[PDB]
Amino acid sequence: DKTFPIMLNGQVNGYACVVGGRVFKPLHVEGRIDNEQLAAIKLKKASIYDLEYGDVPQCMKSDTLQYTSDKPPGFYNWHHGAVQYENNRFTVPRGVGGKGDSGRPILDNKGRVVAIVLGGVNEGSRTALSVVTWNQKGVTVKDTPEGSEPW
Amino acid sequence: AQHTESFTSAISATAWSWIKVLVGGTSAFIVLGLIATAVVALVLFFHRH
């Protein structure tokens, strides 16, 4: 897959993903993307719905496809492991839940991205993730559980 | 003068109708914006659930 991270004085603190037709970047981090083609794009700020601008042309566009409707609570893949939850996000164990893991995409079995994480460091024995998704008819919403620190 | 001047002695009919048009026009533009500002907060609160 293609998910370029965000640099700030050498250390890694953010991740930027590429979807079909657009690029994404979380607002809780500051830094410059190391890709030169991904640095001259006018990334415009937005609300919690996280609107960015995919001004890059077609010839590298659509590395991955956003998820369609009919979302089960079944298996979903993750960079550190797996998640099986649709209404909320799964109680993944420790290790994941550090710092700088914002923007890492959550994908299905067929390589299609479902959600993009933004928070939820550690909520005890059960760890929740504050992600964005499409609720019922493709309208992009933001879900945040209680006490979700920016992660 | 036999009479006495007041504040509203000089205001004619068309002068009073002109300022109440401009009072009502700018107050209508504000409540048009204020209606639409709280409408989209309801549909943003309804897309989540």
Curated annotation (Swiss-Prot), chain B:
Membrane-topology annotation of the record? Single-pass type I membrane protein
Q: Which positions are tagged coiled coil?
A: none
Q: Which domain of life is it from?
A: Viruses
Q: Where in the cell is it found?
A: Virion membrane; Host cell membrane
| PTM per Swiss-Prot/TrEMBL | N-glycosylated.
Ranges in the topological domain labelled Cytoplasmic: 47-49
User: Any stretches that span the bilayer, and where are they?
Assistant: 26-46
On assembly, the entry states: The precursor of protein E3/E2 and E1 form a heterodimer shortly after synthesis. Processing of the precursor of protein E3/E2 into E2 and E3 results in a heterodimer of the spike glycoproteins E2 and E1. Spike at virion surface are constituted of three E2-E1 heterodimers. After target cell attachment and endocytosis, E1 change conformation to form homotrimers. Interacts with 6K protein.
Q: What does this protein do?
A: Class II viral fusion protein. Fusion activity is inactive as long as E1 is bound to E2 in mature virion. After virus attachment to target cell and endocytosis, acidification of the endosome would induce dissociation of E1/E2 heterodimer and concomitant trimerization of the E1 subunits. This E1 trimer is fusion active, and promotes release of viral nucleocapsid in cytoplasm after endosome and viral membrane fusion. Efficient fusion requires the presence of cholesterol and sphingolipid in the target membrane.
Protein name per Swiss-Prot or TrEMBL: Spike glycoprotein E1
Q: Which organism is it from?
A: Eastern equine encephalitis virus (strain Florida 91-469) (EEEV)
